[PDB]
């Protein structure tokens, strides 16, 4: 066996980090992008839109987004992280969470 952390707590952690770096509006925008991604938007468009929303100063946050990306898109996501040089409420939290689970 191995040590692991639940998707729930990880999500909570990532959300707290976002509240640390993003405004309420920006967080809502994040949720909307996540929703579009769940509804069939490509991983590429999702990445681009996230990099646009976060901006150059907050794009590092994308690293912590990694565990929530489906296995099928994980390689593309990693390549995006490498490309951008970063590698190498509760009612809304429920929608975000459901989107996360659905992606998995």
Curated annotation (Swiss-Prot):
Any one annotated GO CC term: mitochondrion
UniProt subcellular location: Cytoplasm
Region: Harmonin homology domain, residue numbers: 2-88
Gene Ontology biological process terms from the UniProt entry: blood vessel endothelial cell differentiation; cell-cell junction organization; endothelial cell development; endothelial tube morphogenesis; endothelium development; heart development; in utero embryonic development; inner ear development
Keyword entries, A-Z: Cytoplasm, Developmental protein, Disease variant, Phosphoprotein
Description of its domains: The C-terminal region constitutes an independently folded domain that has structural similarity with the USH1C (harmonin) N-terminus, despite very low sequence similarity.
Family per record: Belongs to the CCM2 family.
Function recorded in the entry: Component of the CCM signaling pathway which is a crucial regulator of heart and vessel formation and integrity. May act through the stabilization of endothelial cell junctions. May function as a scaffold protein for MAP2K3-MAP3K3 signaling. Seems to play a major role in the modulation of MAP3K3-dependent p38 activation induced by hyperosmotic shock.
Subunit structure: Part of a complex with MAP2K3, MAP3K3 and RAC1. Binds RAC1 directly and independently of its nucleotide-bound state. Interacts with HEG1 and KRIT1; KRIT1 greatly facilitates the interaction with HEG1. Interacts with PDCD10.
Disorder named in the UniProt entry: Cerebral cavernous malformations 2: A form of cerebral cavernous malformations, a congenital vascular anomaly of the central nervous system that can result in hemorrhagic stroke, seizures, recurrent headaches, and focal neurologic deficits. The lesions are characterized by grossly enlarged blood vessels consisting of a single layer of endothelium and without any intervening neural tissue, ranging in diameter from a few millimeters to several centimeters. CCM2 inheritance is autosomal dominant.
Protein's name according to its UniProt entry: Cerebral cavernous malformations 2 protein
Organism: Homo sapiens (Human)
Part of the full-length chain shown: 290 to 436 of 444
